[PDB]
Amino acid sequence: RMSEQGTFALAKVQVDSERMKAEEIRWPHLIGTAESMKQDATVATGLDMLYTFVEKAFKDFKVIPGESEESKKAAKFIEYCLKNMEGQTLRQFARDAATFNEYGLSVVEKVYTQIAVGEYVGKYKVKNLAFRPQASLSRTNPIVYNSDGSAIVGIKQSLSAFQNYVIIPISRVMLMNTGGSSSQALGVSPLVGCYRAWREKILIENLEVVGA
Amino acid sequence: EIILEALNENLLPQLLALNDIRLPETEMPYVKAGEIVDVDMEGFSKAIQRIGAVGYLPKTPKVINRV
Amino acid sequence: RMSEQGTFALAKVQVDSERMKAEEIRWPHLIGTAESMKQDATVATGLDMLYTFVEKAFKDFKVIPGESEESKKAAKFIEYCLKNMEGQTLRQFARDAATFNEYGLSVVEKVYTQIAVGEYVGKYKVKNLAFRPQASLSRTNPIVYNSDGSAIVGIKQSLSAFQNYVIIPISRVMLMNTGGSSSQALGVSPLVGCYRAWREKILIENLEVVGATKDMGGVIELKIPSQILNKAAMDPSSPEADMVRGLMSDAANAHSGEQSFFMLPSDTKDNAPQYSMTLKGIDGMGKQYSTAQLISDRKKSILDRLGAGFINVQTIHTQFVQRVNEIILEALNENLLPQLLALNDIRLPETEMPYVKAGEIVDVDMEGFSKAIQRIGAVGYLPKTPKVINRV
Amino acid sequence: AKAHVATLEGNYSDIVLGRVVAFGDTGWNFKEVDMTFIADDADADSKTTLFAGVLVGEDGTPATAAAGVFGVLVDRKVLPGVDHYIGVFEPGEKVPMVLAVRGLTLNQLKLKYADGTAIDAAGIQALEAQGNQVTDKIVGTQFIGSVL
Amino acid sequence: MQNGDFQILDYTGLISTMPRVDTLLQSMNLFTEHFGRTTVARIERLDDGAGDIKAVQRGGVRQHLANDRKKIVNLNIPFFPLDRSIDRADIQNFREFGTENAPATVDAEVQRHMARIRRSHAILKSKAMYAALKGTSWSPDDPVSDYNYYDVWGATQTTADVDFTKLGVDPIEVLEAEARAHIIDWAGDNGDNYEIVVLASRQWFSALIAHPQVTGAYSQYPSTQEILRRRLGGNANNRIFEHKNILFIEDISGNIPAGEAYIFPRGISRMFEIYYAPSDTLRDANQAAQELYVFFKESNYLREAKIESETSFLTVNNRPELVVKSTGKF
Amino acid sequence: QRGGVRQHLANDRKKIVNLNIPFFPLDRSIDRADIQNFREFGTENAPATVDAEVQ
């Protein structure tokens, strides 16, 4: 019939997966272990080459319209909006979005603004695809669910990011993740798996220097 | 592809809704990313001839602008 | 005659198969042993490459209609329903469905909803192909059978999955499994077989690290008469104590450089000298087993079960991906489409049922294809249709 | 004819319902002392009379009075279903035993003196003084009565 | 499976048993469910009627009416937690007890604990409705609520006793006269033909059928519902009987004291209600309550696993007047 | 009472048994002399056949 008879179990699939990891690569720590990796000259190089082609792909982008006359007008307006963000370009967005290869996760917030003077006066552009760094997110619960572990209601950002030296609704956020199924909100970073090999690789290099 | 799914399915439908552009499913425009491998001048030039010498290549400005 | 005279024996074929497994890979444990595998950098890599092409195939999917005019209308409605799930895409479904390569099993529940406003108002879409994670299922009996072991009545989900920090009828569930016959409800995970090799592979790598750290070849050894050592221990403010403390720091810093040398007294009391300095070495023969090639054999042993063994250097890997695609398509073509058309009372003959065709996993060769069209075209065996033209 | 059969019922968690886990030394809640495993004057195969949940004083001997209680014996060697250490020790031989001292949510009903007598109020006070919570209510179970 | 050191044997199968859990009251659907936010509830009563007019002389004095009546009540709700933990020693070297050599898995124990917790919660919910029907709330060891609805609202317990040893007296002639008369005179509103139901202990129901009057009633011609040759309620465990426009049901659960039976009418509005309150968590605090909450936590240090479940609800009977304690003598 | 202390669950039960199996043989032989000259019972003249006894 027309009725769900189960749950995605987002809140359980996570809690099993945090136990089955070495403790240096659980959520509140992985943010530090990523940046304490990278300074390996083989780990940096792998990430740099990946971003090289991602930026290239999203540089000469195109919008493909439909057949009707209405779609062609819509395609032109879409191209204008995507190429006229105030202080942002898709290359910068692409290289911010692709950070889920380091942390399994990426958060982008959509902000819309009205046009004052231009070709499409009265319409709404997108002001900025505001990137929210993974490091500035909540270290305790980053992602908040229903009373059950069925769906996601929003994403929490730490209060310490509003200082110089809150929950954002899900409808305003674009989530990207990799390495896991649809039931893993915190995706599996490609550095999970590498970690044990990186620990050994480093130790051996240290022995060579002192040995010589 | 992961980035394009978010861009095509989360931003574009909402962006058109704000400016009340409501279209059927078959008329939704979509964004296509660029090509990551450069085109081979030797391969492409001789591919056009082989198709062109038979007449299977349409005469449109789209084909002309590719040079 | 028209009467069955036997049973599939689902409830027995399982109970023999759970005994004939090492106990770390029986149902309630395999869920943990899978996620405690994967963190091996050869096991993750094999699974990641498999999902790479599965997602590619189910990205540019197509629905092939029949000949009659009725089928063409049905095919268009099917394409709309499969491309308009609220919050779901076939790529996400394909990468959730393909999890039976890790656990032998996959459960998806079909939920239908009515349309409020749209092109097909009044009809029924599919809201979500809700994935039920294997970890959230019942750890005791996941699958429930008849009073006999003949057929399946449903699948049980644990009550602990409805909390934050029940039996689903079989007619609502799409089951996919691999590695076993039709009589094995809990399919054989491809990691069964690998397991013994993975256990060995790990142990050997551990021995290499400790072995390289403990190979103290060429270490410095010093011999001093015990009169000096004993005097220092009982007279901390004696000249012997000062020299002993100097040795403990000088010897630690003894590297090779521009001023490295040694100067020792040459006194002699017996056949052996009083003071000496030698660099140790293994008095005999070293290790023989060459643990390097042990690991390489076990790595190729693991990747072969996933068809990704070529990284140790139409193919085997491409043929392996097609197996996973066909299993998913059977569930999609034969369990969802007939039911979806029944709800919107579209009843067609067998020859007029549309079907979904997955995409191609290997990219087309521009050089090969372009010269293939000419050879067919130069003779006139290629029809003049927009289908051929749109291929460019 | 007779069918030699046995049952493997019993559990460990019933004696320790919860623990305070220190992010540092995880052994903060325990202590090891040398108890006598086999009876001193018994034969060579006289299996130990010690049972999990018996109060033990700091001196290591099983407690006999409330004033002589310091911890609860929770050693793996005495847990039900794994008590195969029969005849493996000489009479009166010593062996290190694990004692649970602080940071535990114990079960009152399973605490007993050396002779099996249940713990009293003075024992409760002495054991809780270390920082232990002695719960007085576990649900229990009724298996099959044909009624409930 | 391994036999003695130098011999083997064949493993055959597993046998499992568990006590029955009753759901008759749940099936009857006599309780309405309310999901509140707080732990306190209010009920409003408004009772009205009329008097009699006395004759008076013409042109003289007149007569005056009285006024109405109101009442307000408040109540609290109890709490019910349930927790358990899992340690390494429980799975360190214990065989699964299923297949021959499969090692023990944490998942199996987790599922066992889930099943046990669910069964305990179901049993508690079942007992709650039986306690409520008797006219008092269920809150053992919690004197905070202990609400006796007869005392709270103000009422008395009608007996309607019956004796079965009198073979020459039909017991139904007492049940009708007392119970149905009292129920009709106390329905409160202006209704008709209320349906009557009876819950009876095994002894009471069994004795009722054996009474000579009932047997003689159906013996001499077939009619329908053939008591003598068929079984009351078919092959179902819970027997069902219907005599003289009344429905009789046997209480297999045994919660009703042996020999006792309770008579109450159906259809009456808002006679039974059950309320749920939120749990003691920041996610659910001040939110809408749910039927049951279950939580599970895996220690990030790999040395512990814990399970947690809690619930909070209250069962309220809004009309103690319409419950009669039938008592049999044998 | 809310916000106070909680309660816990009880343990489980297990049992095992062992059994043996019996054995039941049956044997019988046939010889030449049993059918050399005998005549099939119930028939006028047919000679004795070996299979007619095996069946």
| Closest among C350, C355, C325 to C337, alpha carbons compared | C355
Rounded to whole angstroms, how far apart are CA atoms B10 and B32? 15
Q: Is D81 on the interface with E (CB under 8 A)?
A: yes
Query: ∠ at Cα C294 (C292, C296), nearest 5°?
Result: 75
Helix axis angle for E202-210 and E212-219, nearest 10°, is 50
**Integer Cα distance of C54 and C97 in angstroms:** 10
Q: For tokens 């009372």, what's the residue?
A: C345
d(CA E37, CA D62): 52
Report the candidate in A13, A146, E90, E112 with the shortest Cα–Cα distance to residue C159.
E112
Place of tokens 């309220």: E316
Say yes or no for a CB contact (<8 Å) between A66 and B26.
yes
d(CA E94, CA E87): 13
Nearest residue to C21 (alpha-carbon basis) of C252, C192, C255, C276: C192
Copy the structure tokens of residue B41. 């001048």
Parallel, antiparallel, or unpaired: how do β-strands D55-56 and D71-73 relate?
antiparallel
Question: Which residues, in sequence order, are CB contacts of C315 under 8 Å at separation 6+?
Answer: none
* Rounded Cα gap, residues A48 and A59, in angstroms: 17
Amino acid at A94: A
- Helices (H), strands (E): how many in chain E? 7, 14
Question: Is residue A58 left, alpha or beta, with left meaning phi > 0 and alpha meaning psi from -120 to 50?
Answer: alpha
Give break positions in chain A: residue before each, C–N beyond 2.5 Å. Answer: 165
Per the CB < 8 A criterion, the answer to whether E63 and E54 are in contact is: yes
Collapsing DSSP to helix, strand or coil, D112 comes out as strand
D18: closest chain F residue by CA: F8
The two beta strands, E305-311 and E293-298, are antiparallel
Pair of tokens at residue E273: 């209600």
C203/C298 Cα distance (integer angstroms): 11
User: Residues E118, E119, E124, E128: is their CA dihedral positive or negative?
Assistant: positive
Looking up tokens 């130790």 gives: A203
CB environment E208-217: b (16+ within 10 A), e (fewer): beebeebeee
Alpha helices in chain F (DSSP H): 51-54
In this complex, which chains have at least 3 CB pairs below 8 Å with chain F?
D, E
E30: Cβ–Cβ under 8 A, 6 or more apart, which residues?
Answer: E129, E266, E272
CB contact under 8 A, A97 and B3: yes
Give chain F positions within 8 Å (CB) of D13: 11
Contact between E284 and F7 under an 8 Å Cβ cutoff? The reply is no
CB neighbour list of residue E92: distance below 8 Å, 6 or more residues apart:
D76
How far does the CA of residue F21 sit from the closest CA of chain D (Å)?
Answer: 12
Q: What residues contact E34, with CB distance under 8 A and at least 6 apart?
A: E273, E274, E275, E276
C334 secondary structure, DSSP code = I
User: E109 and F33 in contact (C-beta within 8 Å)?
Assistant: no
Long-range interactions of D44-48: CB distance < 8 A, separation 24+: D44/D87, D44/D90, D44/D91, D45/D86, D45/D87, D46/D91, D47/D83, D47/D85, D47/D86, D47/D87, D48/D78, D48/D85
Tokens found for residue E96: 């699964």
CB A14 within 8 A of CB A182: no
Q: Alpha-carbon distance C24 to C192, whole Å?
A: 11
Nearest by CB to A176, from B3, B27, B28: name it: B3
Assigned token pair, F35: 């059918």
Alpha-carbon radius of gyration of chain D? 17
Measured N-to-C along each axis, helices C239-250 and C226-234 cross at an angle, to the nearest 10 degrees, of 110
Q: Cα distance from E51 to chain D (closest Cα, Å)?
A: 54
DSSP code per residue over C133-147: -STTB-SS-SEEE-S
User: Please, are residues A113 and A125 in contact by the beta-carbon 8 Å criterion?
Assistant: yes
Q: Which two tokens stand for residue C201?
A: 């592979």
| DSSP class of B7 | I
Query: Are C163 and C149 spatial neighbours (Cβ–Cβ below 8 Å)?
Result: no
Rounded Cα distance, C218 and B13, in Å:
71
Return all residues near A65 (Cβ < 8 A) that are at least 6 apart. A71, A72, A74, A75, B29
Chain D residues touching F10 at Cβ < 8 A: 14, 138-141
Selection from E141, C261, C119, A135 nearest residue B24 by Cα: C119
Residue A90 tokens, joined = 């898709």
Concatenated DSSP letters of D58-107: TTSSBP-SGGG--EEE--GGGSTT----SS-S-TT-EEEEEEE-SSEEEE
How was this model experimentally determined? cryo-EM
Question: What is d(CA D56, CA D33) in angstroms, rounded to the nearest whole number?
Answer: 10
| DSSP conformation class of C365 | P
Report CA torsion sign: E277, E282, E288, E294.
Answer: negative
Asked if D90 contacts D44 with a C-beta cutoff of 8 angstroms, the reply is yes
- The full DSSP string for B10-43 is IIHHHHHHHTT----GGG--EEE---SSPPPHHH
Q: Which of A16, A23, A147 sits opposite E298 (nearest CB)?
A: A16
Cβ–Cβ gap E297/C19 under 8 Å: no
Phi, psi (deg, nearest 5) at residue C52: -60, -45
Of D10, D138, D141, the CB nearest to F7: D138
How many angstroms separate the CA atoms of A62 and B32, rounded?
5
Cβ-Cβ contacts under 8 Å between E and F: the total is: 29
Residue D77 dihedral angles phi and psi, to the nearest 5°: -75, -5
Q: Does D140 touch chain F (CB under 8 A)?
A: yes
Closest CA to E201 of E126, E247, E254: E254
As a whole number of angstroms, the distance between CA C144 and CA D33 comes to: 51
User: What 8-state DSSP symbol labels residue C238?
Assistant: S
Q: Is C295 on the interface with E (CB under 8 A)?
A: no
For residue C161, give the nearest of A1, A7, A193 by CB distance: A7
Tokens read off for E308? 């947690």
| Cross-chain Cβ contact E300/A15 below 8 Å | no
CB contact, 8 Å: F13 with chain E? no
Inter-chain contact E17–D144, Cβ cutoff 8 Å?
Answer: yes
Chains E and B in direct contact, meaning 3 or more beta-carbon pairs closer than 8 angstroms: no
Q: Which of these, C132, C135, C134, C153, lies nearest to C144 by C-alpha position?
A: C153
Is residue E98 exposed (0-12), middle (13-18) or buried (19+ Cβ within 10 Å)?
buried
Contact F9 E116 (CB under 8 A): yes
Cβ within 8 Å, pair B54-C377: yes
Cα–Cα distance for residue pair E312/F1, rounded to 1 Å: 10
Chain C residue with Cα closest to B52? C374
Chains contacting chain C through 3 or more C-beta pairs under 8 A: A, B, E
Tokens coding E278: 């939120």
Residues in chain D: 148
- E81 vs F7: CB contact, 8 Å cut-off? yes
**Is C105 within 8 Å of C174 (Cβ atoms)?**
no
**Distance from C-alpha of A100 to C-alpha of A105, rounded to nearest angstrom:** 4
Give the relative orientation of helices A90-97 and A41-57 as an angle to the nearest 10 degrees.
140
Distance CA A190, CA A99 (A): 11
Q: Where does residue C129 rank: exposed (0-12), middle (13-18), buried (19+ CB within 10 A)?
A: buried
Transcribe chain A into DSSP letters.
--S--S---HHHHHHHHHHTS-GGGSHHHHHHHHHHSS-SHHHHHHHHHHHHHHHHHTTS-EEE--SSHHHHHHHHHHHHHHT--TT--HHHHHHHHTTHHHHSEEEEEEEEEE-SSSTTTTSEEEEEEEEE-STTB-SS-SEEE-SSSS-EEEEEB-GGGG----EEEGGGEEEEE-SS-TT-SS---THHHHHHHHHHHHHHHHHHHHH-
CB-count exposure of residue F20 (10 Å: 0-12, 13-18, 19+): exposed
| Distance to chain F for D23, nearest Cα, Å | 24
Does the distance separating the beta carbons of B11 and A126 come in below 8 Å? yes
A residues 18-57 closer than 8 Å to C (CB): 20-22
Q: Are C24 and C92 in contact (CB under 8 A)?
A: no
Find the helix or strand (DSSP H, E) in which C388 lies. Answer: helix C386-389
Instruction: Specify the resolution in Å.
Output: 12.7
Separation between Cα atoms, residue A174 and residue E58, nearest integer Å = 88
Alpha helices by DSSP H, listed for C98-190, are 100-103
Instruction: Measure the CA–CA gap between C69 and E280, rounded to whole angstroms.
Output: 61
Cβ contact E306:E297 at 8 Å: yes
DSSP-assigned states of every residue in C255-297: --SSS--------BSSSSBSSEEEE---SS----S-HHHHHHH
3-state secondary structure of C310: helix
**DSSP calls for E226-265:** -TTTS-TTTTSSS-EEE-SS-EEEE-TT--SPTTEEEEEE
For residues E108 and C52, give the distance between their C-alpha atoms in angstroms, rounded to a whole number.
33
In B, which residues are within 8 Å of A174 by CB distance? 6, 10-11
Residue A168 to residue A53: CA distance in whole angstroms: 31
Give the CB-side neighbour count of residue A24, counting CA atoms within 13 A.
13
Distance between start and end Cα atoms, chain D: 34
CB contact under 8 A, E302 and A19: yes
Contacts of A159 (CB under 8 A, 6+ apart): A166
Yes or no, beta carbons of A53 and B31 under 8 Å apart = no
Collect all residues of chain E within an 8 Å Cβ-Cβ radius of residue C16.
none
Residue E97 burial by CB count (10 A; 0-12/13-18/19+): exposed, middle or buried? middle
D148 touches chain E (CB under 8 A): yes
Chain E touched by C269 (CB under 8 Å): no
Q: Which residue spans within chain C are E strands per DSSP?
A: 62-64, 105-114, 124-132, 143-145, 152-156, 167-169, 173-177, 220-223, 276-279, 355-357
Give A202→chain B minimum CA distance, Å: 33
Place of tokens 């009515």: C114
Q: Do F18 and D138 touch (CB under 8 A)?
A: no
Cβ neighbours of C209 in A, within 8 Å: 200, 203-204
Residue E83 contacts F, CB cutoff 8 Å: yes
Which residues of chain B make contact with C371, given a CB cutoff of 8 A?
Answer: 50
CB spacing of C378 vs B54 below 8 angstroms = yes
Q: Which of E236, E254, E279, E250 is nearest to E82 (CA)?
A: E279
Chain-centroid distance of CA C335 in Å reads 26
**Token output for D6:** 């046995």
Residues of B in contact with A62 (CB under 8 A): 31-32, 34
Q: Which amino acid is at F46?
A: A
Short-list D96, D83, D13, D7, CA closest to D49: D83
Contacts of C157 (CB under 8 A, 6+ apart): A6, C132, C136, C137, C138, C166, C167, C168
F12 reaches E (C-beta below 8 A): yes
Q: How far apart (Å, rounded) are the C-alpha atoms in residues C383 and C366?
A: 20
Secondary structure class of C90 (helix, strand, coil): helix
Straight-line distance from the first to the last Cα atom of chain B, in angstroms, rounded to the nearest whole number: 28
CB neighbours of residue E274 within 10 Å: 16
Measured between beta carbons, the chain C residues lying within 8 angstroms of E104 are: 23, 29
Nearest Cα to Cα of residue C95 among C186, C176, C190: C176
Contact D23, D111 (CB under 8 A): no
Nearest CA in chain C to E103: C23
Q: Does A92 touch chain B (CB under 8 A)?
A: no
Nearest residue of chain B to residue A173 (CA atoms): B10
- How is residue D138 annotated by DSSP? B
Chain A residues within 8 A of B26 when measuring between CB atoms: 66-67
Helix, strand, coil percentages for chain C (3-state, nearest 5) = 45, 15, 40
Smallest CA-to-CA distance from A141 within A151, A160, A154 is with A154
DSSP state, residue C309: G
Report the first-to-last Cα separation within chain F, whole angstroms: 83
Closest CA to E159 of E328, E1, E282, E7: E328
E202 and E251 in contact (C-beta within 8 Å)? Answer: yes
Burial class of residue C266, CB neighbours in 10 A (0-12, 13-18, 19+) = exposed
How close E305 gets to chain A, by Cα (Å)?
A: 9
Return all residues near E146 (Cβ < 8 A) that are at least 6 apart: E136, E137, E139
In whole angstroms, what is the distance from residue C232 CA to residue C250 CA?
17
Among chain A residues, CA nearest to C167:
A5
Return the closest-CA partner of residue E277 out of E34, E21, E31, E38.
E38
- Is some CB atom of chain C closer than 8 A to the CB atom of B17? no
Across the interface, whether the CB atoms of B34 and A58 are under 8 A apart is answered yes
CA torsion sign for C103, C106, C107, C111 is: positive
- Please answer yes or no on whether D144 and E18 come within 8 Å at the CB atom: yes
- Neighboring chain E residues of F18 at a CB cutoff of 8 Å: 9
State how far the Cα of C111 lies from the Cα of D136, in Å rounded to an integer.
48
